[PDB]
Design an enzyme around this catalytic site. Structure first.
Site, PDB file in Angstrom:
ATOM      1  N   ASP A 205       0.867  -1.178   0.000  1.00  0.00           N
ATOM      2  CA  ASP A 205       0.000   0.000   0.000  1.00  0.00           C
ATOM      3  C   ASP A 205       0.908   1.234   0.000  1.00  0.00           C
ATOM      4  OD1 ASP A 205      -2.250   1.546  -0.089  1.00  0.00           O
ATOM      5  OD2 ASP A 205      -3.024   0.983   1.882  1.00  0.00           O
ATOM      6  N   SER A 206       0.363   2.386  -0.345  1.00  0.00           N
ATOM      7  CA  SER A 206       1.119   3.596  -0.644  1.00  0.00           C
ATOM      8  C   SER A 206       1.286   4.602   0.496  1.00  0.00           C
ATOM      9  CB  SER A 206       0.394   4.310  -1.805  1.00  0.00           C
ATOM     10  OG  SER A 206      -0.937   4.623  -1.420  1.00  0.00           O
ATOM     11  N   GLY A 207       0.562   4.399   1.580  1.00  0.00           N
ATOM     12  CA  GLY A 207       0.460   5.350   2.662  1.00  0.00           C
ATOM     13  C   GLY A 207      -0.823   6.160   2.651  1.00  0.00           C
ATOM     14  N   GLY A 208      -1.597   6.108   1.560  1.00  0.00           N
ATOM     15  CA  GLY A 208      -2.818   6.886   1.445  1.00  0.00           C
ATOM     16  C   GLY A 208      -3.908   6.616   2.440  1.00  0.00           C
ATOM     17  N   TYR A 209      -3.934   5.447   3.052  1.00  0.00           N
ATOM     18  CA  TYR A 209      -4.944   5.234   4.087  1.00  0.00           C
ATOM     19  C   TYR A 209      -4.503   5.953   5.358  1.00  0.00           C
ATOM     20  CZ  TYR A 209      -7.989   2.665   7.337  1.00  0.00           C
ATOM     21  OH  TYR A 209      -8.957   2.348   8.261  1.00  0.00           O
TER      22      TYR A 209
ATOM     23  N   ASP B 218      -2.571   7.966  -2.856  1.00  0.00           N
ATOM     24  CA  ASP B 218      -3.912   8.529  -2.850  1.00  0.00           C
ATOM     25  C   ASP B 218      -4.255   9.142  -1.507  1.00  0.00           C
ATOM     26  OD1 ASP B 218      -3.974   5.999  -1.524  1.00  0.00           O
ATOM     27  OD2 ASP B 218      -6.144   5.832  -1.926  1.00  0.00           O
TER      28      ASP B 218
ATOM     29  N   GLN C 147     -11.478   6.649  -5.773  1.00  0.00           N
ATOM     30  CA  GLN C 147     -12.116   7.426  -4.765  1.00  0.00           C
ATOM     31  C   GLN C 147     -13.461   7.954  -5.284  1.00  0.00           C
ATOM     32  OE1 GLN C 147     -10.981   7.183  -1.823  1.00  0.00           O
ATOM     33  NE2 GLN C 147      -8.946   6.338  -2.228  1.00  0.00           N
TER      34      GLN C 147
ATOM     35  N   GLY D 104     -11.441   4.057  -0.503  1.00  0.00           N
ATOM     36  CA  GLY D 104     -12.485   4.842   0.151  1.00  0.00           C
ATOM     37  C   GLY D 104     -13.665   4.097   0.699  1.00  0.00           C
TER      38      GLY D 104
ATOM     39  N   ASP E 201      -7.500  -7.373   0.884  1.00  0.00           N
ATOM     40  CA  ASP E 201      -6.567  -7.428   2.001  1.00  0.00           C
ATOM     41  C   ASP E 201      -7.316  -6.997   3.254  1.00  0.00           C
ATOM     42  OD1 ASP E 201      -6.177  -4.357   1.355  1.00  0.00           O
ATOM     43  OD2 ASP E 201      -5.287  -4.695   3.356  1.00  0.00           O
TER      44      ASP E 201
ATOM     45  N   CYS F  25     -12.140 -27.609   8.693  1.00  0.00           N
ATOM     46  CA  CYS F  25     -10.905 -26.960   8.262  1.00  0.00           C
ATOM     47  C   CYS F  25      -9.742 -27.932   8.125  1.00  0.00           C
ATOM     48  CB  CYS F  25     -10.581 -25.874   9.284  1.00  0.00           C
ATOM     49  SG  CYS F  25      -9.026 -25.001   9.006  1.00  0.00           S
TER      50      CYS F  25
ATOM     51  N   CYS G 161      -6.520 -27.040   8.048  1.00  0.00           N
ATOM     52  CA  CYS G 161      -5.257 -26.512   8.503  1.00  0.00           C
ATOM     53  C   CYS G 161      -4.595 -27.373   9.566  1.00  0.00           C
ATOM     54  CB  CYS G 161      -5.419 -25.080   9.032  1.00  0.00           C
ATOM     55  SG  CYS G 161      -5.787 -24.855  10.751  1.00  0.00           S
TER      56      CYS G 161
ATOM     57  N   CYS H  52      -6.029 -27.351  13.124  1.00  0.00           N
ATOM     58  CA  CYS H  52      -7.235 -28.126  13.384  1.00  0.00           C
ATOM     59  C   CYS H  52      -6.933 -29.612  13.304  1.00  0.00           C
ATOM     60  CB  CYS H  52      -8.329 -27.680  12.426  1.00  0.00           C
ATOM     61  SG  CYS H  52      -8.919 -26.001  12.796  1.00  0.00           S
TER      62      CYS H  52
ATOM     63  N   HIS I  73      -4.605 -20.685  11.844  1.00  0.00           N
ATOM     64  CA  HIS I  73      -5.951 -21.167  11.507  1.00  0.00           C
ATOM     65  C   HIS I  73      -6.730 -20.119  10.708  1.00  0.00           C
ATOM     66  CE1 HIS I  73     -10.047 -22.559  11.573  1.00  0.00           C
ATOM     67  NE2 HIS I  73     -10.370 -21.381  12.122  1.00  0.00           N
TER      68      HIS I  73
HETATM   69  C1  0UX Z   1     -10.050  -1.068   6.654  1.00  0.00           C
HETATM   70  N1  0UX Z   1     -10.658  -0.468   5.477  1.00  0.00           N
HETATM   71  C2  0UX Z   1      -9.813   0.136   4.616  1.00  0.00           C
HETATM   72  N2  0UX Z   1      -8.521  -0.049   4.489  1.00  0.00           N
HETATM   73  C3  0UX Z   1      -8.153   0.766   3.445  1.00  0.00           C
HETATM   74  C4  0UX Z   1      -6.855   0.987   2.910  1.00  0.00           C
HETATM   75  C5  0UX Z   1      -5.700   0.216   3.461  1.00  0.00           C
HETATM   76  C6  0UX Z   1      -5.657  -1.224   2.975  1.00  0.00           C
HETATM   77  N3  0UX Z   1      -4.994  -2.105   3.946  1.00  0.00           N
HETATM   78  C7  0UX Z   1      -3.548  -1.913   4.063  1.00  0.00           C
HETATM   79  C8  0UX Z   1      -2.960  -1.904   5.486  1.00  0.00           C
HETATM   80  C9  0UX Z   1      -3.456  -0.704   6.302  1.00  0.00           C
HETATM   81  C10 0UX Z   1      -2.930  -0.773   7.750  1.00  0.00           C
HETATM   82  C11 0UX Z   1      -3.309  -2.104   8.371  1.00  0.00           C
HETATM   83  C12 0UX Z   1      -2.752  -3.288   7.593  1.00  0.00           C
HETATM   84  C13 0UX Z   1      -1.247  -3.195   7.478  1.00  0.00           C
HETATM   85  C14 0UX Z   1      -0.844  -1.880   6.842  1.00  0.00           C
HETATM   86  C15 0UX Z   1      -1.426  -0.740   7.669  1.00  0.00           C
HETATM   87  C16 0UX Z   1      -1.428  -1.840   5.418  1.00  0.00           C
HETATM   88  C17 0UX Z   1      -3.351  -3.212   6.190  1.00  0.00           C
HETATM   89  C18 0UX Z   1      -6.767   1.964   1.902  1.00  0.00           C
HETATM   90  N4  0UX Z   1      -5.514   2.224   1.266  1.00  0.00           N
HETATM   91  C19 0UX Z   1      -5.418   3.147   0.350  1.00  0.00           C
HETATM   92  N5  0UX Z   1      -4.211   3.457  -0.227  1.00  0.00           N
HETATM   93  N6  0UX Z   1      -6.512   3.875  -0.109  1.00  0.00           N
HETATM   94  C20 0UX Z   1      -7.795   3.645   0.376  1.00  0.00           C
HETATM   95  O1  0UX Z   1      -8.717   4.279  -0.071  1.00  0.00           O
HETATM   96  C21 0UX Z   1      -7.889   2.657   1.442  1.00  0.00           C
HETATM   97  C22 0UX Z   1      -9.184   2.430   1.954  1.00  0.00           C
HETATM   98  C23 0UX Z   1      -9.246   1.478   2.967  1.00  0.00           C
HETATM   99  N7  0UX Z   1     -10.294   1.041   3.717  1.00  0.00           N
HETATM  100 ZN    ZN Z   2      -8.051 -24.700  11.082  1.00  0.00          ZN
END
Ligand code: 0UX
Ligand code: ZN
Ligand code: 0UX
Ligand code: ZN
Lengths: 363, 363
Positions: A92-96, A137, A184, A211, A261, A299, A301, A304, A330
């Site tokens: 992932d890019s850091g956008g969340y 993003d 988005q 989003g 993910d 399961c 795994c 189990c 599991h």
């Molecule tokens: C929960 N709902 C949600 N997630 C989202 C993420 C992160 C995906 N998971 C990666 C991540 C995020 C955190 C938690 C774990 C490990 C690491 C840090 C990478 C998964 C998102 N990432 C980006 N770039 N853009 C989104 O719009 C977005 C929307 C989300 N909506």
């Molecule tokens: Zn199992």
């Protein structure tokens, strides 16, 4: 193998099953990607992650740039060598975190002190040696007014173009990795369309639905998926970011999503929640203290096959690391088995029946 | 296999190498037994523990009686089935907690509310299905006056007789398990002799040296071992309880000890200490941040075949469970490799040279 190829082998409605071929391996779709923040899928060795059936794992720009550092990981040989996972990695890019976290934002990027911008994010993903790179993003917060959603979305599309250009300007990255754009638009159909149009005009190897899973609930998420996924190019993978519970996944696949993910199987596992075909259970509950059955009856795994609910109940209540190891193995295996059942049922043309059967039993 | 047989295959000085045959497997001596409090060797699956070369693991009456409970474990099939370790298990009796912990003591036993006595301890070990049962004793605190050491030791010998009688009165236990007595006497030669005499008069399958590694330091521990181990029957195994660092083990073997248990490889591992043939290292230290070498250059364990110091440094600093898993696997493997080198060198008549070489390099 090619740098990137997606081929669809079978369809049922909007659902698809197929494969993504990349230099480091093949990814069966629909796919679940176990995640991590610190160059590990928490409480599992890579070999264990692979044994559950995962084809690809997810890492993240924001956390790895803080610890241990992107430059450091590159000096040490890249993320794959560092953590011992030689199959594809999506980052992932850091956008969340632009949403979830401490910042000053501008058109240039976001300061956290650490800065991220389209260029820096793509550079970090290069340094990590990510196979699937996510554009930088902004995950728009929910709820958002239409005006704010539009402004956010437009910035993301400008950042998406900058992300594409940064990626293409680094020949080793462009020749060996894939780049996904992120749609988005919040919950608004016209903004989602505008975003899909912008992204396809730029052109990406895959398209994420960003989003969502930001507090709108399943019904609203599904409503948005209903119109948003058909806006994306059909011939490229569709990734729903941060989703989700098993029933979220089934419904999303029904709406055209190929990749997922989520922290749930890992995090929930360490907190005592086990997924089962009869729904989730909290293994800490006293009702499990003398229960000799495995976590789940069907399961496949390793957990189990060998240990009882009673033992794992004890381990979690005692705060033992092995409790987290077993629960996590599991739950990841469960998720992988769900994905296999989904792939098989689409390839056999009985996915709608599976989705039905799945929900009746799980609920 | 018999209920219990110890045979000595080779000697060098006071050092011995051989085997203990029991119904659930063979134990190569000198032996290191990984330990646990809660029906787990912390952060390792049983299969991993066995892969490092352990032949036997240790559990404990005091902790298992509190959680999950001895009766509960028996209802569920016993400790071996519960935790998934099918090879021998030795259980301590609770006598070290009589010292280390909350109590009211009397000739009957010790109340912690939970009570332990010779009879209850042996019963709990039966319920767990322990293969090697320890007599219920008092680990005398250090320092102790001669008067206090004697009184303590005498009580332990009375408790030792009660332990033998309780064990013999339960036919299934007496036919399938072994019973070890524990020598006390603090640092005093005449009390150690009196204790050895009492224990051999009762008669046990093996003899532990108790009451050491309680703050007296290595030099004093070795001085006491010098006269205490020859007091024990030569033809039965000699177990030094709670020892120790690699150099403690080598010296103790030089003085006639066959069996060891210690929390150090597990605990220290989770805290960032790695054992190496060049001495221990603290993997958290900044000097390891970019070190691509394995924990130890010669170690055969799976962790040293695959991951670098740099990665494990990162994992421990980040508080990741996999960091504890990897450090623990390595340290237990290290300890098992030390024991193998000790067994081989005694069987080849070059143990004194090994001990010398070992110390020059380790220090
Ligand atoms: C929960 N709902 C949600 N997630 C989202 C993420 C992160 C995906 N998971 C990666 C991540 C995020 C955190 C938690 C774990 C490990 C690491 C840090 C990478 C998964 C998102 N990432 C980006 N770039 N853009 C989104 O719009 C977005 C929307 C989300 N909506
Ligand atoms: Zn199992
Ligand atoms: C450290 N030095 C030392 N230990 C000692 C022990 C405990 C052995 N380890 C078992 C144990 C003890 C704790 C820590 C772990 C797990 C579980 C609880 C069982 C090992 C001892 N046990 C008994 N019955 N008697 C002793 O004299 C004695 C002296 C010791 N001197
Ligand atoms: Zn090693």
């Amino acid at each position: 193998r090619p740098r990137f190829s997606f081929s669809i082998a079978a369809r049922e409605g909007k659902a698809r099953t197929g494969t993504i071929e990349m230099k480091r391996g093949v990814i069966r779709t629909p796919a679940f990607m176990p995640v991590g923040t610190a160059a590990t899928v928490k409480a599992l060795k890579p070999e264990t992650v692979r044994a559950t059936g995962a084809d690809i794992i997810l890492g993240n720009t924001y956390h790895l740039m803080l610890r241990p550092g992107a430059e450091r990981i590159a000096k040490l040989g890249g993320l794959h060598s560092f953590m011992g996972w030689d199959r594809p990695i999506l980052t992932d890019s850091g956008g969340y975190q632009v949403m979830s976290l401490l910042t000053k934002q501008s058109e240039e990027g976001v300061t956290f002190r650490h800065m991220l911008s389209p260029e820096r994010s793509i550079e970090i993903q290069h340094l990590l040696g990510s196979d699937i790179v996510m554009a930088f993003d902004e995950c728009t917060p929910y709820p958002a007014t239409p005006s704010r959603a539009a402004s956010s979305m437009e910035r993301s599309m400008r950042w998406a173009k900058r992300s594409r250009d940064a990626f293409d300007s680094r020949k080793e990255q462009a020749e060996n990795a894939a780049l996904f754009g992120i749609q988005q638009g919040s919950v608004f159909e016209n903004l989602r369309q505008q975003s899909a149009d912008a992204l396809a005009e730029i052109g990406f190897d895959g398209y994420a639905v960003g989003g969502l899973a930001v507090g709108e609930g399943q019904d609203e998420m599904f409503r948005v998926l209903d119109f948003s996924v058909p806006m994306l190019p059909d011939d490229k993978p569709h990734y729903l970011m941060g989703v989700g519970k098993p029933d979220d996944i089934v419904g999303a696949v029904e709406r055209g999503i190929d990749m997922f993910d989520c922290v749930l199987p890992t995090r929930s596992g360490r907190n005592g929640q086990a997924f089962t075909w009869d729904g989730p259970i909290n293994i800490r509950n006293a009702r499990f203290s003398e229960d000799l059955k495995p976590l789940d009856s069907e399961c496949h795994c390793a957990v189990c096959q060998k240990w009882s609910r009673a033992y794992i109940h004890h381990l979690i209540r005692a705060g033992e690391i092995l409790g987290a190891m077993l629960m996590t193995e599991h739950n990841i295996a469960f998720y992988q088995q769900l994905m296999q059942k989904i792939r098989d049922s689409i390839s056999e043309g009985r996915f709608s029946q599976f989705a039905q059967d799945f929900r009746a039993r799980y609920f």
